[model samples]
Each structure stands twice: as structure tokens, then as C-alpha cells.
Target: MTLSILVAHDLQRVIGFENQLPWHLPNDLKHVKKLSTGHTLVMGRKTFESIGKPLPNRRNVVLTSDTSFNVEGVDVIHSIEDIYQLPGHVFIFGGQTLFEEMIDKVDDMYITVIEGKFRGDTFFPPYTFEDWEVASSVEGKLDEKNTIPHTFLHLIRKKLVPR
Candidate 1:
């Protein structure tokens, strides 16, 4: 399966605060919807709870330790390993902990790099470019509503060829 991660972070790598996004960037939201559609989105229970319901046109798989957790129209799995058994490409959506667990396994990453630092409690896991190569990048404008300038980046992990 092709595993991927979709995230939007500020200059400081802050992704969220108080169980919600630090900024309401409509363009970024739309970008996420486009990339995540027609795939299996694996996220933590907190992320699912923040969104309040299943996202349309995609299979929502939530990872939680609570055995009794149940949501109509949502598939609940107990561990990260269980994600592997699901069919098709899987996109790792976040809430810090989930991203940290799956970051090393993702094949590609769709990152929206928002300009400027922001106040947030949660941050994306630290990463280096040595093992990944930028596949594509597009500079974004500072729209009237979403004031922050941003760039959309698609990065793929460099495959190791065995000698």
C-alpha cells in the first residue's frame, strides 16, 4: 500500500492548539480534501473528534485505545499496526501522536508550509530532508481571507536500492 501524510504547519511547525487548527485556512482545507479523497484516512481519535464526523468521500479510520469507542460511519481500529490490514492507499492524518508513530513509514508527504510562526500546543514531528526528496512544490499567494503566504510541497522518500 502507498502510505502518505497530509499536514499544514506554520514556520515553527505548529499544527494545532486546543484540539483544533490554529488557523482557519480554507484553501489548505480544500487542498487536504482533494488529496485525501478516494483513500483511507488513518487518524487518531482526537483528530476524528475535532472534525466531529466522517469526512465525505473517504473511509475514515480512527485509532484509539478505548475499546468501547464507536461512531456511526467510522471504522475504529485499536493500534497503528491494524492500519496495515486495511485495503488501498492510507493517508496518515494527525494529532501529533499519530503522526509521530507513522512518520517513518509514509511513502510520500503532502505538506503545506504556512508562512510565519503561530501559537500552538501541538507540533509536527521533527524531520530531516536527507531521506526524502522534493517531488514538487508550488508557491501560494496570501489571499484576502487566508492571509498567510504558503507553499504546497509533495515529497517522496528516497528508496534504497540493495547492492
Candidate 2:
């Protein structure tokens, strides 16, 4: 079992604008599905709302504080727990708050970095390279359909220092 993070963001760490993805890249969309297929997904309510349905082939777990939040096919947790006490692979899907909360627990980080900085309402929280190493990096192929230049990276933590 492992804790991981998967994010597609622009150069400014911008993940979304007005609660929606600021840009579209088909490859990145496919990349996320390929990796998260059979894993557990841990995401925020707003992020869940954007996607709007339980993603197929995965366990959907939403972290929300709303007392009345009840949705079929989705498990809701009111507070952060020892969620790390889970099976197989667990990916942190986000809006910003969840990213900050789980930033340190990540064993792996798969990022699709868009080339240019963008204006946004939500951002990926501050993280540093001093603690991680790039295990693999592949430049995303740019086509007319996916014009934005981007790169895919798999970063593995160099150290696991418990907080």
C-alpha cells in the first residue's frame, strides 16, 4: 500500500479556476485514468463535484465536513483520519486543501506540468525538490488536439520523515 498524489497543473501551481480545470489536455486525462484505475481515490468535495460521478474501477472516498452529504457510490469522511491505513495504492485527488493536508504523506507524486503560468482560484500547495527525486520524466507529446506543452513526471520520495 502507498500514499500518492496526482495533479495536472500549470507553471504557477494553478490547478483550477472558478472550481473547474483551467485547461484541457487529453493525455493528462488519460494518464490519470490509467494510474488510478484500480486504486483508492481520496479527494475533496468540490473536486468530487467537478467530476460529478464516481469514477469507474476505483473506490471513491471523499473528505467533506458537510453533515448532510450523502451520495451513493461514494464514501464520505468528516475528518482526516489514519486514511493511510488503506490497501493497495491510494491517490490524493484534489482541490487545494487536501493537497496541503497530505503533502508530507505522499510516497509518490505523478504530475503533469503545463508549460505556462496561469491565473487561477485554486493552487497546488508549496512543495520542494529537496525531499524528492524524479524517478521518470516524459515530455507530453503536443498535437493540435492537445496544444499545451506539458511534461509527465513520476517523483519518488527520497526520504520519509514522519511528522
Candidate 3:
């Protein structure tokens, strides 16, 4: 299975505030839906709660330390290692902790870079670009409805070059 990550963040790397996205960008949501339609989505319990329901047409896997945490229409597991056992392509969604735990294990990433700063209490974990190579990017335009300028970046882990 190919392990991947999909996320949208503001210039300050802020991903959430009070369990919700800091800004509304329908296009970015659409992008997420487009990419994850047939794949498995792995996320922390907090991330799953933020959405409040299983996303249709994809397998929702929630990771939580709480053994009793359970929700209808989703698979709940207790460890990050359990995520690796699932078959097929898996996309890691986040709530800081999940991202930090799985960042190094992801094979690819689809990142939406929102072009402005916003007030937020939660953030995307920091990652170094040295091991990743940009595969493609779509420059987003600012429309009246989608006010924020953003770029959709597709990155893949670079193969190691032996010295």
C-alpha cells in the first residue's frame, strides 16, 4: 500500500483552530475529495471528530490511544503501526500528533499552500524538503468566492543516491 498525506495549511502552517479549519476554501476541500475518493484515510480521533462523520466513498480509519473510542462507519485502531497493516493506498489526515508520527513514513504528499496568515491554535508538523521532490504543482487563482490564493503541490519522497 502506498502511504500518502493530504493537507491544506496557511502561510504560518496553521491547519486548525478550535477543531475547525482556520479558513473556508471549498476548492481545497474539493481537491481533497478528488484525491482521496478511493483511498483509505488515516487520521487521529480528533481529526475524525472534527469532520463528525465518515467521508463517503473512502475507508475511514481513526487512530486513538483510548481503547474505548469507537464510532459507527469507521475503523478504530490503537497504534500508528496498525495503520501500516492496512492494505491498499492510505492517506494520512491530521491533528498535529498524527502528522508528526507518520510524516516520515509517507511516500507522497498533496499539500495546499494557502497564501496568508490566519489565527489558529493547531499547526501542521514541520517537515524538511531535502528528502522530498516536487512532482507537480498547480498555481491557484484568487476568485471572489475563493478569496485566498493557494497552490496545490504534489511531492514524492526522493530516492536515496548512494555516494
Candidate 4:
């Protein structure tokens, strides 16, 4: 089973602000949907709430410890292992704990790295370049009216060496 983790973070590596993005980057959202269309996205409850509702035409599997928590239009799961049973590539969308939990299982990562720094309350896990290789990268500056500049980078995690 192949799993890919996707994210958009700040220059300081922050992932969220007040449990949401501090910048306007609809392009990043569009890119996420493009890659995750037929795939399953695993995210934490906060991330789920931040999205407001299920993203149409995609499978959303949210992880939360709250046993009583439930929502329409989403498949709420309790554990990371449960996500593995889902079809297609399991993409880890963030909040923090969910990303940290599945970082080891990730086979690849797609990041829309924003150029400007911003203050935030959440962050994605730090990964070593030595552990992964850049598969591709496309740089784009924000539209003239927008303040943020960004680059989209795709990386494949190196296969583990068997002990």
C-alpha cells in the first residue's frame, strides 16, 4: 500500500493558524484536490473542522479520540491503522498529531511551500532531506494582488534499508 502525505506550510514551518491557514492560497487547495481526487485523506478532527465539511468527490477519513464525535459526509475513524484499509493512496492532511502519527508510513510528500513567513499555532513534522529525494518542483509567485509567494515541491521518501 502506498501512502502520500500532503501539506502547505509557512517559512517557519508552521502548518496552521487558529487551526486554519494564515494565508490565501486557493491554488494550493486546488492542487490538493487534484492529487487526492480518487484517494483517501486522513486528517485530525481539527483539520476536519477547519475544512467545514467533506470535500466533494473525495473520501475523507478523520482521526479523533472523541468516541462520540460523528459528522455527516465523512467517515470518522478512530485509529491510523483503520485508514490503511481505505482504497487508493492514503494522503495525510494535517492538524499535527495525525501527521506525526503517519509520518513514518508516508512513502511520499507533496508540499506547497509558501515563501513568506507567517506566525502560526501549528506545524508539520520536520523531515530530513537525506531521507527523501525531490521528485519534482514547480515554483510560482503569488498573483500581483496576493502577498504570498510559493513553490510546489514533490518528494519521494527513500525506501528503508532492511536491518
Candidate 5:
């Protein structure tokens, strides 16, 4: 199965600051929901909590060390192995640590990179150009009165040779 990281971050490449986002990008969220609508989404516990609730129209598989916690419309799994047990295209949304843990397993990335930097304490892992290549990009200016300048880029990693 193909694995991909679906992310939305600010110009500073910050995913979150103080467990919350530094900016509002409704278009990016809609892009995520649109592509992930019928697939399974794998995210860390903190990331899930940041959302404050379950997202509809997809399987929400949250990874957390706390096994006792459970929420309606969300399946809480304790290990990464459980993520592999899932079928079909799986999207990994993150809160940093989880992204670091699963970066090697990712075959592609769907990233929304904002142009205006916002101060934050979180960021996505660094990408190695030798391992991945930009496959596509759609650029647009942020609504000057509202949104942030950003571009949606899809990067595909080179196929790994079987060991």
C-alpha cells in the first residue's frame, strides 16, 4: 500500500505552536478533507486532541500510549503495528513526534506550505532531496484580506530497492 503524509503548515514550516495552529487556512483544511474523505487517517494522540474531536467520513486511527482512552467515531490504537493492520491508502497527519517516527515509511507527501511565517514550536521533519522529488505544485496568493500566501506541493519519494 502507498503511504503519504498529508500536512498543512505555516511559512516557518511550523505545524503547531502551543498545541494550536498559528494561522487560519480553511482552503488547506478543505483540501485535506477532500483527498482524505474516503481513506483512513493515522495521527498521533496529541494531533487528534488538537482537533478536539473526531473527523467524519473517514476512519480516524489515533496512536497513543494511553490505551484506556477512547472516543466515539475514533479508533484509538496503541502501536504503529496497528497502523499497518489497516488497509488501503493511509494518510498520516501529525504533531511532530509521530511524523518523525513514520517519515521513513512515507512514500509521498502532500504539503501546503504557507508563504507568511508564523512563530511556532513545531515543524515537519526535514526532507532528503535524494530520496524524494517534487511531483506537482499549484501556487496561489493568499486572499490579501484573509488567507496566507501558499502553494500546494506533492512530493514523491524514489522507489526503494528490495533488500
Candidate 6:
């Protein structure tokens, strides 16, 4: 299965404040549904907790060290290696360390940059400068009640190609 990291962070690289998003960009949620729907989603236990329920119409896999952790609808796995064995296109939905570790494993990244910086204690993992290139990008709307300017970007890992 092709693996990808799907994340949204602000200018300061802050992803969350107290297990919640710092801003309200409704458009991003719609776009998230478009990309992850019908795909297998892998997220940390806390990530699942923040959302509070299984996301509909997709397979939810929760990763955690607490093997005792169990939920009704989602599958539970213990390690990062387990992520590779899952069927279908898998999206790494996160809560910090999950992205921190899996950054090296993802084939691509779906990054949504929320324009302004806000207070947040959590950050997505830092990566090397030249590891990826933008495959495509779309500017977020400012027309509706959603005032913040955001961007949806698709990035693919840099690979050597013969001249």
C-alpha cells in the first residue's frame, strides 16, 4: 500500500493546542474528507480520542503502546511496522510522535498550511530541506466565513531520475 501523511499545521509549524486545532477552517475539513474517504487511515490513540468517534466510510486504525486499548469499530495496532502491512492506501493521521517517526516512511504528504500562527504546543516532525517537491497545490478560500488564508499542497519525495 502507498502511504502518505495527511496533516494541517500553521505558519509556526504548530499543529495543536491541547488536543485541538487552533483555527477554524471549514474548507480544510471538506478537503480532508475528499482525500481520506475510502482510504485506510492510521492515527494515534490520542488522535482518535480528540475526534471522539470512528470517521465514517473508511477504515480507522489506531496506533498505541497501550495494547489494552480497544474500541468498537476501529482496528488497533501496536507499532509503526504494523502500518506497512495494512491493505490499501494508508493515510497517517496524527498526534505528534506518530508523524515524527513516520515522516521517513511516507511516500507523499498532504499538507494544509493554515496562514496565521496561533498558540500551540504540538508540532509536526521537522524534515530535511530537500526531501520533497510540490506535486500540486491549491489556494484556500477567504470568501466565506473562513477568514484565514490557507493552502492545500501535495508533495512527493525527491527521487533521482536519469537525464
Q: Quick one: best lDDT, which candidate?
A: 6
Residue-level error in angstroms, candidate 4, position 142:
2.9
**What would you estimate as the lDDT of candidate 2?**
0.88
As a whole number from 0 to 100, the lDDT of residue 34 in candidate 2 is: 96
- In candidate 4, position 36 carries an lDDT of 91
lDDT tens per residue, model 2, 36-129:
9988999999999999999988999999989898898888887778476667889999979999898887888998889988889999987778
Q: List, residue by residue over 51-152, the lDDT tens digit for candidate 5.
A: 988898998889999968888999888988787778889999897988888888888899888887788898988877688888989985566544677898
Can you give the lDDT of residue 91 in candidate 6?
A: 95
- What residue runs in model 1 are displaced by over 4 Å at the alpha carbon? 160-163
The candidate 3 region of ten consecutive residues with least summed lDDT is 123-132
* Regions of model 3 farther than 4 Å from truth: none
Error of 3 at 65 (Å): 1.8
Candidate 3's C-alpha lDDT?
Answer: 0.89
Query: Could you give me the TM-score of model 6 versus the true structure?
Result: 0.95
* Candidate 4 Cα deviation (angstroms), residue 58: 0.1
- For model 4, the superposed segments whose C-alpha errors exceed 4 Å read 160-163
Question: Model 6, 3: alpha-carbon shift in Å?
Answer: 0.2
Residue 142 in candidate 1, Cα distance off native in Å: 2.6
Whole-model lDDT values for every prediction: 0.89, 0.88, 0.89, 0.84, 0.84, 0.90
Q: What are the per-residue Cα lDDT tens digits for candidate 6 across 1-163?
A: 7999999999888999999999988898898899999999899988899999999999999998997888988999998899999989999999788999898888999999898989999998876547789888899878767899999989999986886
Candidate 5, residue 80: the lDDT equals 81
Q: Distance from true position, residue 18, model 3, in Å?
A: 1.2
